[PDB]
Design a binder for this molecule. Sequence first.
Ligand SMILES: Cc1ccc(-c2c(C)sc(NC(=O)CCCC(=O)O)c2C(N)=O)cc1C
Length: 278
Amino acid sequence: VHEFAKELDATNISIDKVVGAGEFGEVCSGRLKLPSKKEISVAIKTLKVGYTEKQRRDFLGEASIMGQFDHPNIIRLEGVVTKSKPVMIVTEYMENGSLDSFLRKHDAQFTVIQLVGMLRGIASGMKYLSDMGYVHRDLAARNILINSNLVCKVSDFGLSRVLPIRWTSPEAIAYRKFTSASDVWSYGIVLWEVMSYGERPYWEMSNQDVIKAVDEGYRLPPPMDCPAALYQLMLDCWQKDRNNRPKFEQIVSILDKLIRNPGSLKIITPSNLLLDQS
Ligand SMILES: Cc1ccc(-c2c(C)sc(NC(=O)CCCC(=O)O)c2C(N)=O)cc1C
């Protein structure tokens, strides 16, 4: 873990608040005093008391991965604490939490340009992540964190691997073909989640029907008041042929253009899912 993660001194960490419960323990907020004496807000994951050796390797595995990425749109690892207890993972603090829960609180309250900014950040992080040879495999709004200034960052590298049905590409479902192109599929789902202000992909459809419908060519319908440009980008991301999906670099390019000319977004778009003939 120490190849990519600094060991932090626990005396430099203050825990101010328990903010939630994670797979391996509590999630807290607090402060970290840096070697320069500067103090920053951080989030802290603790490893639960009584952990097995396996839980420890799995827990810290997320830090080893996170530690490899230094990018404004990937959650920043400040370090770990292993030489004292409890065992900790320390990251930058993301005040507005997971993106899907944040958007659910603010239905229809942001501008299209604001949403596109969010979407651009996610794509830029994923562009870097794919550049680095990593397939995330669990790209979803719930795994995106958003900070006080609405900057969105890819997080949760639990299932991430060196090269969740609703977010997974058909080919990855069919025979575990995970590529960066299957992450792009997932991105298309995230894009739908954002424009839907945190509605659940495919709502509560049975898993078997999600698989079958998507395979038959059905796609999530356009979110309310969704710009045609953004809905078509979802469709491009959801191409049956993974070869035909845009690369993350192209997605970033597309979103940089939509940001540049807000006039672009003014065009607005027999079953609940739509049959995309393409
Ligand atoms: C390694 C890692 C990964 C993600 C986080 C993290 C969560 C799982 S949740 C949250 N931030 C919030 O929930 C904001 C709550 C706001 C409030 O309580 O007022 C974070 C995070 N990075 O801030 C944490 C770690 C350590």
